[PDB]
Amino acid sequence: VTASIDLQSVSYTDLATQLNDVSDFGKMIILKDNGFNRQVHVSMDKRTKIQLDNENVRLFNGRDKDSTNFILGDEFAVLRFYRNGESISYIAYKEAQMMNEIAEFYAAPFKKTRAINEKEAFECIYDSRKYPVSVKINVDKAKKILNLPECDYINPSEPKTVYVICLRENGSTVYPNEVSAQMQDAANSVYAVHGLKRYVNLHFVLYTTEYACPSGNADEGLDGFTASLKANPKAEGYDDQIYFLIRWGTWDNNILGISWLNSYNVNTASDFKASGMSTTQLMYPGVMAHELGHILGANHADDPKDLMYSKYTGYLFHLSEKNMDIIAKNLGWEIADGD
Amino acid sequence: VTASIDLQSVSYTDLATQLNDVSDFGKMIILKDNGFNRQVHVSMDKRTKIQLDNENVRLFNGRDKDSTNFILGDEFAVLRFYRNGESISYIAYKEAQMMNEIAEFYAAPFKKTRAINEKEAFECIYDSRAGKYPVSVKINVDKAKKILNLPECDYINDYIKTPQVRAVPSEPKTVYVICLRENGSTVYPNEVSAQMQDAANSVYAVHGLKRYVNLHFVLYTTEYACPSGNADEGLDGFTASLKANPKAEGYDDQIYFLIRWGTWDNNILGISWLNSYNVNTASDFKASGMSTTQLMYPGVMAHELGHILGANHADDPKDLMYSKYTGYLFHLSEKNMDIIAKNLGWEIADGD
Numbered sequence: 001v002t003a004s005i006d007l008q009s010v011s012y013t014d015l016a017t018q019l020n021d022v023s024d025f026g027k028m029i030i031l032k033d034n035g036f037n038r039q040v041h042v043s044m045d046k047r048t049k050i051q052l053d054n055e056n057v058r059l060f061n062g063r064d065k066d067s068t069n070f071i072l073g074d075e076f077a078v079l080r081f082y083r084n085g086e087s088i089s090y091i092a093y094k095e096a097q098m099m100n101e102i103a104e105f106y107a108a109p110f111k112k113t114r115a116i117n118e119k120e121a122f123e124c125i126y127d128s129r130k131y132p133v134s135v136k137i138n139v140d141k142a143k144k145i146l147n148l149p150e151c152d153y154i155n156p157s158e159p160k161t162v163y164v165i166c167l168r169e170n171g172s173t174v175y176p177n178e179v180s181a182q183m184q185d186a187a188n189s190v191y192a193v194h195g196l197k198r199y200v201n202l203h204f205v206l207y208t209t210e211y212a213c214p215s216g217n218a219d220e221g222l223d224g225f226t227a228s229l230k231a232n233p234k235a236e237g238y239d240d241q242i243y244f245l246i247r248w249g250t251w252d253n254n255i256l257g258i259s260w261l262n263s264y265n266v267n268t269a270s271d272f273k274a275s276g277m278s279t280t281q282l283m284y285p286g287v288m289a290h291e292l293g294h295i296l297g298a299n300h301a302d303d304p305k306d307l308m309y310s311k312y313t314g315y316l317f318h319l320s321e322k323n324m325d326i327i328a329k330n331l332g333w334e335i336a337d338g339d
Numbered sequence: 340v341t342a343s344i345d346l347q348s349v350s351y352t353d354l355a356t357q358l359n360d361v362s363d364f365g366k367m368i369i370l371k372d373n374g375f376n377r378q379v380h381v382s383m384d385k386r387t388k389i390q391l392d393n394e395n396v397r398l399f400n401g402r403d404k405d406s407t408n409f410i411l412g413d414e415f416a417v418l419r420f421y422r423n424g425e426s427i428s429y430i431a432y433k434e435a436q437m438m439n440e441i442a443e444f445y446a447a448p449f450k451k452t453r454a455i456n457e458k459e460a461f462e463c464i465y466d467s468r469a470g471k472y473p474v475s476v477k478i479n480v481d482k483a484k485k486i487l488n489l490p491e492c493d494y495i496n497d498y499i500k501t502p503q504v505r506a507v508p509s510e511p512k513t514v515y516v517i518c519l520r521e522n523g524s525t526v527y528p529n530e531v532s533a534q535m536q537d538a539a540n541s542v543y544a545v546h547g548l549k550r551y552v553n554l555h556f557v558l559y560t561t562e563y564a565c566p567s568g569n570a571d572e573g574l575d576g577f578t579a580s581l582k583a584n585p586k587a588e589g590y591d592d593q594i595y596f597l598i599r600w601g602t603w604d605n606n607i608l609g610i611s612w613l614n615s616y617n618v619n620t621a622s623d624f625k626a627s628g629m630s631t632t633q634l635m636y637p638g639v640m641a642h643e644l645g646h647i648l649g650a651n652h653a654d655d656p657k658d659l660m661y662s663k664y665t666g667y668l669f670h671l672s673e674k675n676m677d678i679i680a681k682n683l684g685w686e687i688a689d690g691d
């Protein structure tokens with residue numbers, strides 16, 4: 001009698017019908033696979049707004065104990081949950097030609113070195129009687145199979161609408177599911193701290209820019225990105241918003257992203273100071289969240305399970321009490337307000 | 340500095356960026372033209388859900404005194420307001436090739452019969468900030484039907500019958516209005532979602548029915564096509580097709596519609612089984628009908644949804660359920676409102 005999603009044949013239509021059924025009161029959906037089940041209570045994420053090149057993308061969350069998240073756009077749908085501490089994404093594109101391009105893209109690195117457990121890290125999901133309907137990627141198993149070299153860092157009455165204006169770097173190709181996952185992880189990292197949804201509602205937008213980094217250097221790239229915003233007339237009057245140059249790859253010495261530390265404050269934001277750069281590749285979730293953290297004043301953390309750890313860890317939440325205080329204050333929150 | 344929309348150059352991006360910024364608290368937008376101004380307070384319609392072939396379409400309403408409505412999908416955006424009693428729509432498609440096809444489609448009948456004040460009934464809006472292709476089209480439906488001299492259609496015998504025919508819920512019931520594009524038919528997204536928006540709003544306007552139901556419209560293609568121009572024979576086959584369709588098994592308790600762009604024999608705008616829905620007795624795909632989706636006849640799907648919910652032909656020419664096509668979109672008949680609200684689980688004790 002309960003609704004369910006079969007991960008052995010999950011398509012865009014499967015996720016789209018289920019997620020489009022979720023009312024304001026939430027919906028119970030059972031995630032089904034071979035040797036797997038999970039009843040989740042899905043609800044619409046009504047805090048975050050997303051447009052990718054003017055295309056509305058919706059977010060859905062399960063309960064805290066479900067570790068499940070969803071992304072639903074008109075052309076793609078994503079299911080991301082945690083199973084034995086590993087992140088598993090099911091990415092389904094609506095158009096047959098696009099799903100094949102996406103499946104080819106995600107399958108290519110494994111085609112070089114055949115894996116002992118390829119099906120556990122990456123698998124093409126097929127229709128129940130050929131073209132794939134979705135792809136399954138266990139990020140944690142994939143990074144172990146691919147032997148990927150290390151990428152890292154160095155060094156109110158109504159909530160306020162803050163725009164996170166993402167700009168696809170000139171010459172870059174970013175993938176919709178990949179970009180909106182970095183965005184979903186960024187907003188959720190923020191709303192998890194001190195009940196910040198009462199203070200801010202993040203609106204992510206994505207456009208293309210004529211600006212491209214003049215070299216592989218990330219410091220020179222961000223300096224140039226900030227300077228390009230100040231000279232861009234399409235950004236005149238938006239100097240008080242958050243900005244990100246997004247690309248698929250990384251910068252020199254495998255830098256995942258960069259940003260100006262403590263560059264945003266709901267009352268002092270100006271001169272496009274609150275800007276950064278980020279990769280959007282699926283194998284490194286939480287990079288945009290980590291940079292959005294630095295932009296909101298968060299410092300490098302001592303806990304290896306913290307999002308703001310000095311090194312890249314795959315964790316997506318702020319665990320540091322000092323960082324949570326700094327971030328929430330920058331968004332207008334005070335200790336007297338509570339959580 | 341309030342936000343505003345210039346109707347002298349309104350594009351998809353213009354409507355999309357404005358409607359996409361509307362928060363849960365609503366937004367004040369000024370509609371600007373050559374001297375005309377209207378401040379409207381837009382808010383998202385959170386009662387109705389719409390997917391057209393799995394593409395999400397959102398609705399926005401102004402205040403009651405604004406007479407303004409919006410439709411926002413990924414590929415098109417619509418603004419529909421009233422000015423001096425006439426219904427004006429601004430239809431903007433996102434893709435250049437699609438906007439040009441749409442502009443050509445809407446302009447074509449006006450080239451056959453060239454009017455002096457064509458600009459009043461129909462106009463291609465161009466990029467003033469400059470441009471070469473249209474960014475949207477303006478259609479004053481009431482002036483267009485007068486210019487085109489469209490042969491009138493009426494709901495004369497638009498219903499058939501069958502010889503068989505508690506408390507306010509914690510959450511209103513989700514009722515799906517499953518629309519199926521007839522085989523061989525081409526329906527236009529803006530046109531279809533306008534018939535749907537007018538159908539849901541006709542329902543929520545009666546006895547505070549949003550507390551009892553939340554309508555969810557979906558659109559798919561069906562292999563069924565009417566075997567003749569007859570509407571009674573068409574609806575009989577449509578209902579039968581549903582019973583023999585396995586993709587509809589377990590959904591016999593929902594509302595159904597065969598949709599097309601044109602009309603049936605003797606210019607019938609649509610048809611449906613009278614008093615075919617009830618939140619507690621709905622079954623066997625009884626609550627089904629057929630409807631045109633052409634822009635020049637707004638309210639046909641609402642009129643048929645009315646018939647499905649038990650509404651009879653009204654006597655007031657300003658009523659939605661009047662037997663002749665009038666262009667009004669609301670039930671004014673006290674008896675029809677009682678019949679419709681009762682079928683959706685409402686009682687006099689509950690109030691409005």
Ligand SMILES: COc1cc(=O)n(C)c2c(OC[C@@H](O)C(C)(C)O)cccc12
Binds near residue numbers: 167
């Ligand atoms: C090249 O960059 C941009 C490209 C582009 O198309 N636009 C419009 C930009 C932009 O618009 C304001 C936008 O966020 C609002 C608040 C209206 O929703 C802001 C910042 C940059 C751009």
Ligand SMILES: COc1cc(=O)n(C)c2c(OC[C@@H](O)C(C)(C)O)cccc12
Binds near residue numbers: 561
């Ligand atoms: C031609 O008939 C149909 C064609 C078609 O593609 N489908 C899937 C239909 C259908 O889907 C269930 C739908 O309402 C839910 C509840 C999932 O949103 C229901 C009824 C009919 C169809």
Ligand code: PRO
Binds near residue numbers: 011131132134
């Ligand atoms: O996922 C879907 O809905 C369809 C079928 C396979 C490719 N596109």
Ligand code: PRO
Binds near residue numbers: 053208
């Ligand atoms: O809408 C899009 O996704 C295309 C791809 C590059 C930028 N514009």
Ligand SMILES: [Zn+2]
Binds near residue numbers: 153154310
């Ligand atoms: Zn860092």
Ligand SMILES: [Zn+2]
Binds near residue numbers: 085313314315
């Ligand atoms: Zn981990």
Ligand SMILES: [Zn+2]
Binds near residue numbers: 315316
């Ligand atoms: Zn995690």
Ligand SMILES: [Zn+2]
Binds near residue numbers: 497642646
């Ligand atoms: Zn009638």
